[PDB]
Amino acid sequence: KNIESLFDYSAGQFEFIDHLLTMGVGVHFAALIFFLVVSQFVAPKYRIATALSCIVMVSAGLILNSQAVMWTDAYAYVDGSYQLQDLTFSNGYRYVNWMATIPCLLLQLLIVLNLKGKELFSTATWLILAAWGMIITGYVGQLYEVDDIAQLMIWGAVSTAFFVVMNWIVGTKIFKNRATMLGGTDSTITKVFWLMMFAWTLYPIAYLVPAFMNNADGVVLRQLLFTIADISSKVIYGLMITYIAIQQSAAAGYVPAQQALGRI
Ligand SMILES: *C/C=C(C)/C=C/C=C(C)/C=C/C1=C(C)CCCC1(C)C
Ligand SMILES: CCCCCCCC/C=C\CCCCCCCC(=O)O
Numbered sequence: 139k140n141i142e143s144l145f146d147y148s149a150g151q152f153e154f155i156d157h158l159l160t161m162g163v164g165v166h167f168a169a170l171i172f173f174l175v176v177s178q179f180v181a182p183k184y185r186i187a188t189a190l191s192c193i194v195m196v197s198a199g200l201i202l203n204s205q206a207v208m209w210t211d212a213y214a215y216v217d218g219s220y221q222l223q224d225l226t227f228s229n230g231y232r233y234v235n236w237m238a239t240i241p242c243l244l245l246q247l248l249i250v251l252n253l254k255g256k257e258l259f260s261t262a263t264w265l266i267l268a269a270w271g272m273i274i275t276g277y278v279g280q281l282y283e284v285d286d287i288a289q290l291m292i293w294g295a296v297s298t299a300f301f302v303v304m305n306w307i308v309g310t311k312i313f314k315n316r317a318t319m320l321g322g323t324d325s326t327i328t329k330v331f332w333l334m335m336f337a338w339t340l341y342p343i344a345y346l347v348p349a350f351m352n353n354a355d356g357v358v359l360r361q362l363l364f365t366i367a368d369i370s371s372k373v374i375y376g377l378m379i380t381y382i383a384i385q386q387s388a389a390a391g392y393v394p395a396q397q398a399l400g401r402i
C-alpha cells in the first residue's frame with residue numbers, strides 16, 4: 139500500500155537510504171548520552187524536561203534502527219538492482235511511534251514554560267488529543283498513498299486542521315508564558331516555537347511526496363525529509379529545551395547549573 143513497494147532501487151538509492159537511517163540512529167543515541175550526563179545540572183523542577191529528551195532519543199533511535207533493518211530485510215540485490223523480497227518496508231510504523239514521541243516533545247515544552255498543576259495537566263491533555271487526532275488521521279491517509287491519492291489528500295486536510303489547532307495551542311502558551319521565564323530564556327523560547335513550526339511542517343511535506351513525486355527518487359526524498367525533520371524536531375529541539383532548562387535552573391539558584399555554565 140506504500141509507494142516504496144512499487145519500485146526497484148539502484149545500489150546508490152538503496153545504500154543512501156540505509157546510510158540516512160543508520161546515521162539517524164547514531165545521532166540520536168549520541169545525543170542520548172549528552173542529555174543523560176547534563177541532566178545532573180538541571181534543577182528538580184525542570185529535570186524531567188531533559189529526561190524526556192532521553193526518552194525521545196531512544197524512541198526515535200529505535201524506530202530508525204527498526205526502519206533500517208526492515209529496509210535491508212525487504213530488499214536484495216537481484217539482476218542489477220535492489221528488488222523487494224518476502225518482507226515488507228513501510229513508514230506506517232513511524233506514525234505509531236509519533237503517538238508516543240510527539241506527546242513527549244510537547245510535554246518537555248510545557249515544563250520549561252513553567253506550567254504547573256492544573257494548567258499543566260489540562261494543556262497537556264488538549265495538546266495530546268490534538269496530536270493524536272493529527273497522527274491517526276494522517277496514518278489513515280497514508281494507507282491510500284498508492285490506491286487513492288484523493289483520499290490521501292482529504293485525510294491530510296483533516297490532519298492538517300488538527301496540526302494547525304495544536305500549533306495554535308503551542309504558540310498561545312509560549313507567547314503567553316514567555317514573560318515567566320528566567321535567565322534570558324524568554325528570548326530563547328521564541329526561537330523554539332519557530333524551530334517547531336519549521337521542523338514539524340516537513341512531515342506533511344513528506345506525506346505528500348506520493349502526490350508530487352511518485353518514483354524511486356521520491357522515496358529517497360521522503361527519507362531525506364524525515365532525517366532533516368527528525369534531527370531538527372528531536373535533537374536540535376531537545377538541545378534547546380535542555381539549554382533553557384539549565385539556564386532557568388541557574389537563574390533560580392540551582393548551584394550545579396550555575397557551576398556547569400561557569401565551566402563554559
Ligand atoms: C519526531 C516526530 C515528529 C515531531 C512528527 C511530527 C509529525 C507531524 C507534524 C505530522 C503531521 C501530518 C500532517 C500535519 C498532515 C499529514 C499527516 C501527518 C500526520 C504527516
Ligand atoms: C539538520 C539537517 C540534517 C541533515 C541530514 C542529511 C545529511 C545528508 C544529506 C544528503 C546530501 C545529499 C546526498 C546526495 C543524494 C544523491 C542521490 C542518490 O544517490 O539517491
Ligand SMILES: [Cl-]
Nearest residue numbers: 181182183184
Ligand atoms: Cl527545582
Ligand SMILES: [Cl-]
Nearest residue numbers: 198235236239
Ligand atoms: Cl519518532
